[PDB]
Amino acid sequence: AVQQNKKSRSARDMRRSHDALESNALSVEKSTGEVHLRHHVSPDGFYRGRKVVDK
Amino acid sequence: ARVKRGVIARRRHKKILKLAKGYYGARSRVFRVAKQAVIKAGQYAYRDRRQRKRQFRALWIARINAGARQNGLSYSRLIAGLKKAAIEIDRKVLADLAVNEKAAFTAIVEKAKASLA
Amino acid sequence: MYAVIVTGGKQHKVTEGEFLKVEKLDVATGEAIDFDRVLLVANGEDVKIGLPVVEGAKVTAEVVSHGRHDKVRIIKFRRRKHHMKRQGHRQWFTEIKITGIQA
Amino acid sequence: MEVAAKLSGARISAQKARLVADQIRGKKVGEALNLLAFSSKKAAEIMKKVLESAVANAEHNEGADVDDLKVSTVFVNEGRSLKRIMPRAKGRADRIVKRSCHITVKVADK
Amino acid sequence: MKTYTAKPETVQRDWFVVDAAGQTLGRLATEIARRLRGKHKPEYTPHVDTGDYIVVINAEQVRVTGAKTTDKMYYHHSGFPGGIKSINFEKLIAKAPERVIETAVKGMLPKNPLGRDMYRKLKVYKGASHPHTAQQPQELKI
RNA sequence: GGGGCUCAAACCACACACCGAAGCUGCGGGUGUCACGGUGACGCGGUAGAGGAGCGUUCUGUAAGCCUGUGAAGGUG
RNA sequence: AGGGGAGUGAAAUAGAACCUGAAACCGUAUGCGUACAAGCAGUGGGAGCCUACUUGUUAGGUGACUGCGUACCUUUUGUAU
Ligand SMILES: [Mg+2]
Ligand SMILES: [Mg+2]
Ligand SMILES: [Mg+2]
Ligand SMILES: [Mg+2]
Ligand SMILES: [Mg+2]
Ligand SMILES: [Mg+2]
Ligand SMILES: [Mg+2]
Ligand SMILES: [Mg+2]
Ligand SMILES: [Mg+2]
Ligand SMILES: [Mg+2]
Ligand SMILES: [Mg+2]
Ligand SMILES: [Mg+2]
Ligand SMILES: [Mg+2]
Ligand SMILES: [Mg+2]
Ligand SMILES: [Mg+2]
Ligand SMILES: [Mg+2]
Ligand SMILES: [Mg+2]
Ligand SMILES: [Mg+2]
Ligand SMILES: [Mg+2]
Ligand SMILES: [Mg+2]
Ligand SMILES: [Mg+2]
Ligand SMILES: [Mg+2]
Ligand SMILES: [Mg+2]
Ligand SMILES: [Mg+2]
Ligand SMILES: [Mg+2]
Ligand SMILES: [Mg+2]
Ligand SMILES: [Mg+2]
Ligand SMILES: [Mg+2]
Ligand SMILES: [Mg+2]
Ligand SMILES: [Mg+2]
Ligand SMILES: [Mg+2]
Ligand SMILES: [Mg+2]
Ligand SMILES: [Mg+2]
Ligand SMILES: [Mg+2]
Ligand SMILES: [Mg+2]
Ligand SMILES: [Mg+2]
Ligand SMILES: [Mg+2]
Ligand SMILES: [Mg+2]
Ligand SMILES: [Mg+2]
Ligand SMILES: [Mg+2]
Ligand SMILES: [Mg+2]
Ligand SMILES: [Mg+2]
Ligand SMILES: [Mg+2]
Ligand SMILES: [Mg+2]
Ligand SMILES: [Mg+2]
Ligand SMILES: [Mg+2]
């Protein structure tokens, strides 16, 4: 099955009105002021004021 | 003598696409669809110069009816009364007095009434 | 003070010092003309309804300019019958200014 | 001020890159740099390097302060595409286009 | 000297109250639709709503002639197969007395956005009283 | 056609009024044919098809001219 | 890779995929419209809003609401078909 008429410019842009991206929950560590994902270990290896992996 | 069509063909397509300004979708930006839209627009415009004169007489007549029945007379009885006495005033002028100069419209309706029509 | 006059097969409601465009007249620019076929003169609360033409009333005007209206385009198209025709039109007019209304 | 930075021929489709450009349009560069650092899209890694170039252009060539800047204009245009051949069943050959794009970022302190 | 046209921001509207106390349904409904549309004013234009407000109070005492009290039917379809439903004039008066007058007037109005706007100015009630005393409607004899 | 219509908004007679086309008249223009010496007159829907009159493109003569860096052709308002 | 400056040049939006750089097609910015409304998407009428200047018998952009209105070619006795 295939279209009998081609979609207009307006019609395909209405289908993409749900394609927008959402943002993530970012947090700041109180000790060092470093931004990280909420509930995740920071890129420097800290979580909840503690050193977990040290790279 | 070989003739190239590039310049003349482009000038002719741009005249059509300029008349198709403001139309929707492909009717304002591709020649094949815009050419038919311009022709049908000119077909409508020729016909609607006749219909403009019909739509405006119907509007004047409806407004004269509303103003005459406020003075105790119907449209058909007022037109017969006007023709009986003297008056040659247009429906266009009559509909203007019915809205703007209401004291003059009353005098005419009263004179048409006095012709026993 | 206003009047109803007939000119060019149409009727116009007219007030003093008014500019209006009527059908082309055979009058030179700047020349004065008068309108004897006056159908109605109304002076505030006084209205003279014209048995066909109001007796003694006359409306004067001066010719301001001659010109042509914007072009209209005529097309005659008969579909799938191999026929088409085009035409242009600009209609002449005379612009007059109403100088005085004699009741 | 309004200093720009451009990346011509980024190896990604324009439709995919415009989803990330809508996220940063009109924001301060500090809060738009953190958004791009934690995005899961590939177009966010490409566009984060262009934004950092525009910030570095403003500091060196214009003497701007990063803490007073914000991204004012961002758009994605189309680049030239490569054409390749993909074999299908029963001897049929299909044609592949590999699309690219041009990415422009402008920052402004005013 | 162009033709006068009404402007929706500068239209004068009145309030009227009409009693249906032994009036024929269709000859009362034609007077109502004429005034909802503004056909009684010299300012009437086909594309703006110049009409008045009509309040109808004794909606259950409207009448029909002949044998129409039991033989006049109202049909509607629900959109489901076999979903055609009917009710007669006698039973509809018992259940929804106001729907009788609204159905008659609505069919005498244009079927477009402007026609639905004129219909919004019709207030039909089944008592002898209405909730619109603050608007002070004037009496309209049929 | 719908709403709705019952001493009708049905039907049968009679009467008067009005609405209603690109028909007719009014006003302003353009054209064909014929007559007279610019006027009069009647014409001017159209497929196949016949007849008449034109626009624009490239090249040659006019041109060893004329235009053009104080801005040609082309593109876009 | 690609860019922002600086330089060369009469001119780099003449920067090497380099004279001019149209259209389809894809974007960003601004103005007006659009979430109770049914159909060849136009046209007759027409309010409101925005811009410009001659501050409204003006010019430009939008077009709420409303009357009419079933594409083009071919082939046919005849096509929205
Ligand atoms: Mg599919
Ligand atoms: Mg389809
Ligand atoms: Mg198809
Ligand atoms: Mg198909
Ligand atoms: Mg098909
Ligand atoms: Mg999608
Ligand atoms: Mg050729
Ligand atoms: Mg438009
Ligand atoms: Mg008519
Ligand atoms: Mg008419
Ligand atoms: Mg094989
Ligand atoms: Mg494809
Ligand atoms: Mg009908
Ligand atoms: Mg009788
Ligand atoms: Mg008659
Ligand atoms: Mg007519
Ligand atoms: Mg004729
Ligand atoms: Mg004539
Ligand atoms: Mg004829
Ligand atoms: Mg002919
Ligand atoms: Mg030559
Ligand atoms: Mg120049
Ligand atoms: Mg040449
Ligand atoms: Mg230099
Ligand atoms: Mg250039
Ligand atoms: Mg160049
Ligand atoms: Mg050169
Ligand atoms: Mg180039
Ligand atoms: Mg282009
Ligand atoms: Mg868009
Ligand atoms: Mg709305
Ligand atoms: Mg609703
Ligand atoms: Mg729809
Ligand atoms: Mg409908
Ligand atoms: Mg208009
Ligand atoms: Mg305007
Ligand atoms: Mg419109
Ligand atoms: Mg319309
Ligand atoms: Mg239709
Ligand atoms: Mg229709
Ligand atoms: Mg064909
Ligand atoms: Mg066949
Ligand atoms: Mg057949
Ligand atoms: Mg046969
Ligand atoms: Mg047909
Ligand atoms: Mg078809």
Coordinates of N, CA and C in Angstrom, one line a residue, chain C residues 35-102:
Chain C
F35 N -25.7 71.2 -12.6 CA -26.5 70.0 -12.6 C -27.9 70.4 -12.3
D36 N -28.7 70.4 -13.4 CA -30.1 70.9 -13.3 C -31.1 69.8 -12.9
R37 N -30.8 68.5 -13.1 CA -31.7 67.4 -12.7 C -31.3 67.0 -11.3
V38 N -31.9 67.8 -10.4 CA -31.7 67.5 -8.9 C -33.0 66.9 -8.4
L39 N -32.8 65.7 -7.8 CA -34.0 64.9 -7.3 C -34.4 65.2 -5.9
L40 N -33.5 65.7 -5.0 CA -33.8 65.8 -3.6 C -32.8 66.8 -3.0
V41 N -33.3 67.8 -2.3 CA -32.5 68.7 -1.5 C -32.9 68.7 -0.1
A42 N -32.0 68.4 0.8 CA -32.3 68.4 2.2 C -31.4 69.4 3.0
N43 N -32.1 70.3 3.7 CA -31.4 71.3 4.5 C -31.7 71.2 5.9
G44 N -30.8 70.4 6.6 CA -31.0 70.1 8.0 C -32.4 69.4 8.3
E45 N -33.3 70.1 8.8 CA -34.6 69.5 9.1 C -35.6 69.7 7.9
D46 N -35.2 70.5 6.9 CA -36.1 70.8 5.8 C -35.7 69.9 4.6
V47 N -36.6 69.2 4.1 CA -36.4 68.2 3.0 C -37.3 68.6 1.9
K48 N -36.8 68.9 0.7 CA -37.6 69.1 -0.5 C -37.5 67.9 -1.4
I49 N -38.5 67.1 -1.3 CA -38.6 65.9 -2.2 C -39.0 66.3 -3.6
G50 N -38.2 65.9 -4.6 CA -38.5 66.3 -5.9 C -39.5 65.6 -6.7
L51 N -40.7 66.1 -6.8 CA -41.5 65.8 -8.0 C -40.6 66.0 -9.2
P52 N -40.6 65.1 -10.1 CA -39.4 64.4 -10.6 C -38.1 65.2 -10.4
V53 N -38.1 66.5 -10.7 CA -36.9 67.3 -10.5 C -37.3 68.5 -9.6
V54 N -36.5 68.7 -8.6 CA -36.8 69.8 -7.7 C -36.7 71.1 -8.5
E55 N -37.7 71.9 -8.4 CA -37.9 73.2 -9.2 C -36.9 74.2 -8.6
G56 N -36.0 74.7 -9.5 CA -35.2 75.8 -9.1 C -33.8 75.4 -8.5
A57 N -33.7 74.1 -8.0 CA -32.5 73.7 -7.5 C -31.4 73.5 -8.5
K58 N -30.2 73.7 -8.2 CA -29.1 73.5 -9.1 C -27.8 73.3 -8.3
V59 N -26.9 72.4 -8.7 CA -25.7 72.1 -8.1 C -24.6 72.3 -9.0
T60 N -23.6 73.2 -8.6 CA -22.5 73.6 -9.4 C -21.3 72.8 -9.0
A61 N -20.3 72.6 -10.0 CA -19.1 71.9 -9.7 C -18.1 72.4 -10.7
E62 N -16.8 72.1 -10.4 CA -15.7 72.4 -11.4 C -15.0 71.1 -11.7
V63 N -14.5 71.0 -12.9 CA -13.8 69.8 -13.4 C -12.4 69.9 -12.9
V64 N -12.0 68.8 -12.1 CA -10.6 68.8 -11.5 C -9.6 68.1 -12.4
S65 N -10.0 66.9 -12.9 CA -9.0 66.1 -13.7 C -9.8 65.1 -14.5
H66 N -9.1 64.5 -15.5 CA -9.5 63.3 -16.2 C -8.5 62.2 -16.0
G67 N -8.9 61.0 -16.1 CA -8.0 59.9 -15.9 C -8.7 58.6 -16.2
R68 N -8.0 57.5 -15.9 CA -8.5 56.1 -16.1 C -8.4 55.3 -14.9
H69 N -9.3 54.4 -14.7 CA -9.3 53.5 -13.5 C -8.2 52.5 -13.7
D70 N -8.0 51.7 -12.6 CA -7.1 50.6 -12.7 C -7.5 49.5 -13.7
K71 N -6.6 48.9 -14.3 CA -6.9 47.9 -15.3 C -7.6 46.7 -14.7
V72 N -8.6 46.2 -15.4 CA -9.2 44.9 -15.2 C -8.9 44.0 -16.3
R73 N -8.8 42.7 -16.1 CA -8.4 41.8 -17.1 C -9.5 40.8 -17.4
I74 N -9.8 40.6 -18.6 CA -10.9 39.8 -19.1 C -10.3 38.5 -19.7
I75 N -10.8 37.3 -19.3 CA -10.4 36.1 -19.9 C -11.6 35.2 -20.2
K76 N -11.6 34.6 -21.4 CA -12.7 33.7 -21.8 C -12.1 32.4 -22.1
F77 N -12.4 31.4 -21.3 CA -11.8 30.1 -21.4 C -12.9 29.0 -21.4
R78 N -12.8 28.2 -22.4 CA -13.7 27.0 -22.6 C -12.9 25.8 -22.4
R79 N -13.1 25.0 -21.4 CA -12.2 23.9 -21.1 C -12.3 22.8 -22.1
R80 N -11.2 22.2 -22.4 CA -11.0 21.1 -23.3 C -11.7 21.3 -24.6
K81 N -11.9 22.5 -25.0 CA -12.4 22.9 -26.4 C -11.4 23.7 -27.2
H82 N -10.2 23.9 -26.7 CA -9.1 24.5 -27.5 C -9.5 26.0 -27.8
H83 N -9.8 26.7 -26.7 CA -10.3 28.1 -26.9 C -9.8 28.9 -25.7
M84 N -9.4 30.1 -26.0 CA -9.0 31.1 -25.0 C -8.9 32.5 -25.6
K85 N -9.2 33.5 -24.8 CA -9.1 34.9 -25.3 C -8.8 35.8 -24.1
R86 N -8.0 36.8 -24.3 CA -7.7 37.8 -23.2 C -7.9 39.2 -23.7
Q87 N -8.2 40.1 -22.8 CA -8.5 41.5 -23.1 C -8.2 42.3 -21.8
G88 N -8.0 43.6 -22.1 CA -7.7 44.5 -21.0 C -8.7 45.7 -21.0
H89 N -8.9 46.4 -19.9 CA -9.8 47.5 -19.9 C -9.4 48.5 -18.8
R90 N -9.4 49.8 -19.1 CA -9.3 50.9 -18.2 C -10.4 51.9 -18.5
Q91 N -11.2 52.2 -17.5 CA -12.4 53.0 -17.8 C -12.1 54.5 -17.5
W92 N -12.5 55.4 -18.3 CA -12.3 56.8 -18.1 C -13.2 57.4 -17.1
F93 N -12.8 58.4 -16.4 CA -13.6 59.1 -15.4 C -13.2 60.6 -15.4
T94 N -14.1 61.4 -14.9 CA -13.8 62.8 -14.7 C -14.0 63.0 -13.2
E95 N -13.1 63.7 -12.6 CA -13.1 64.1 -11.2 C -13.6 65.5 -11.0
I96 N -14.7 65.7 -10.3 CA -15.3 67.0 -10.1 C -15.4 67.3 -8.6
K97 N -15.3 68.6 -8.3 CA -15.5 69.1 -6.9 C -16.7 69.9 -6.8
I98 N -17.6 69.6 -5.8 CA -18.9 70.3 -5.6 C -18.6 71.6 -4.9
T99 N -18.9 72.7 -5.6 CA -18.7 74.0 -5.2 C -19.8 74.6 -4.3
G100 N -21.0 74.6 -4.9 CA -22.2 75.1 -4.2 C -23.5 74.4 -4.5
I101 N -24.3 74.2 -3.4 CA -25.6 73.6 -3.6 C -26.6 74.7 -3.4
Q102 N -27.4 75.0 -4.5 CA -28.5 75.9 -4.4 C -29.7 75.1 -4.1

